[PDB]
Structure 1
């Protein structure tokens, strides 16, 4: 398991958490020096449990699929909650078995669905460590509307930070003050699958992407990523989604 405590949290302890999260995702191979998540994992080993504690020390446990860093559901006291998708219902067979009741959320785990349920795109939703404390608090008591926004915060401050060093740094900058994600943050989130696939297809194309990936950079400018010498590949991305799962 991995854990993160918002009480006493600073850029450094958040960093350790993101490192611990990445370290808990298995790989047998690295591709252009980037860990390649597994094609699949059988049984309960498929799910990582993240123990998150808010400022007051209350806690939720979040179930994460180690092949794709997708959050499947979470446990709040004696109730488990799962996204309304076959993958999460499959996860429910393995995690939080001991919960008193299991609630299926009235949405699946994707950004579009969650933004509809929350009432705002994530461009407008502040993220940061304080926002993560708010999200943990919100998830402790069922409210499907509030939970959508909380889960949008949670996914970004965990899974997305694990996937991109830039995103991890963005959250570290927001350790004491939330701010809506940069356009580069949104762009990277949106391109993870695409990037993961082009990096793998470059393996036998001399490091050249079969298809250029369009991104917004740190200055908020639109750049074209065409090969593995790009800083997005050499410095930023930390985990690759396996092409088997694309």
Structure 2
């Protein structure tokens, strides 16, 4: 398991946490020094628990699929919560088995569902460590009507931070304040599957993508990414989704 405690948290301790989270994920290969995640694992190997404790020392445990870094659900005390999707119901066979209550959330874990449910787009939802504290509180004392926004903070603070060094650094920087994510962060989030696919192809294609990926940079300009010498590849993306989980 991996743990993070928000009380006494610093930029350093968050980075340590995100490192351990990455180390928790199994990989057979590295392509261009980036961990390539596994395609398939049996149930007993497939899930990792991360425990997150807020300033008030209230703890939730979150189940992630180690092949795609997707959050499957979480536990708060004696109640488990799972997303309403097929991979989450599979997860429910393996994690949080001793929970007395299990609730299935009214939506899957994808952003378009969550943003609709929250009634807020990602760019308008504060991130930063105080934001993560608030999300943990909201999920611990589950209120249906706040859960979706809190789940989006949780996902971005764990899974998305794991996938990209830039997102890790941007969230970790905000210890005592919060911030709205730029479109650079949103486009990295949007483009993980595509980047992963093209990087795997590039390794067979002299470092060249078969199909470009358009990202938005920190100056807000659309940039076209076509090979592994681009900065997003050399210095940013930290995990590769296996092409077999692309469909």
TM-score (norm 1): 0.99
Aligned to 1:15: 15
Aligned to 2:31: 31
Q: CA deviation at 1:194?
A: 0.4
Aligned to 1:125: 125
Aligned to 1:56: 56
Measured in 2, the distance between the counterparts of 1:75 and 1:98 equals 10
Aligned to 1:114: 114
Aligned to 1:98: 98
Q: CA deviation at 1:145?
A: 2.1
Measured in 2, the distance between the counterparts of 1:44 and 1:102 equals 20
Aligned to 1:175: 175
Q: CA deviation at 1:73?
A: 0.3
Aligned to 2:223: 223
Q: CA deviation at 1:221?
A: 1.8
Aligned to 1:65: 65
Measured in 1, the distance between the counterparts of 2:145 and 2:194 equals 30
Aligned to 2:76: 76
Measured in 2, the distance between the counterparts of 1:193 and 1:174 equals 27
Aligned to 1:190: 190
Measured in 1, the distance between the counterparts of 2:4 and 2:45 equals 21
Measured in 2, the distance between the counterparts of 1:186 and 1:53 equals 26
Correspondence list, 1:132-147, <5 A = 132-147=132-147
SS class of match (1:108): coil
Q: CA deviation at 1:15?
A: 0.3
SS class of match (2:74): strand
Tell me if structure 2 keeps the 8 A contact 1:107–1:114.
yes
Query: Does 1:201 pair with 2:201?
Result: yes
SS class of match (2:96): coil
Aligned to 1:156: 156
Measured in 1, the distance between the counterparts of 2:37 and 2:67 equals 5
SS class of match (1:223): strand
Q: CA deviation at 1:143?
A: 1.6
Q: CA deviation at 1:44?
A: 2.4
Q: C-alpha root-mean-square deviation of aligned residues, in Å?
A: 0.7
Q: CA deviation at 1:203?
A: 1.1
Tell me if structure 2 keeps the 8 A contact 1:79–1:102.
yes
Q: CA deviation at 1:21?
A: 0.3
- Structure 2: gaps (5+ residues): none
Aligned to 2:240: 240
Q: CA deviation at 1:122?
A: 0.9
The number of residues matched between the two structures is: 246
Q: CA deviation at 1:173?
A: 2.1
Query: Does 1:85 pair with 2:65?
Result: no
Tell me if structure 2 keeps the 8 A contact 1:44–1:95.
no
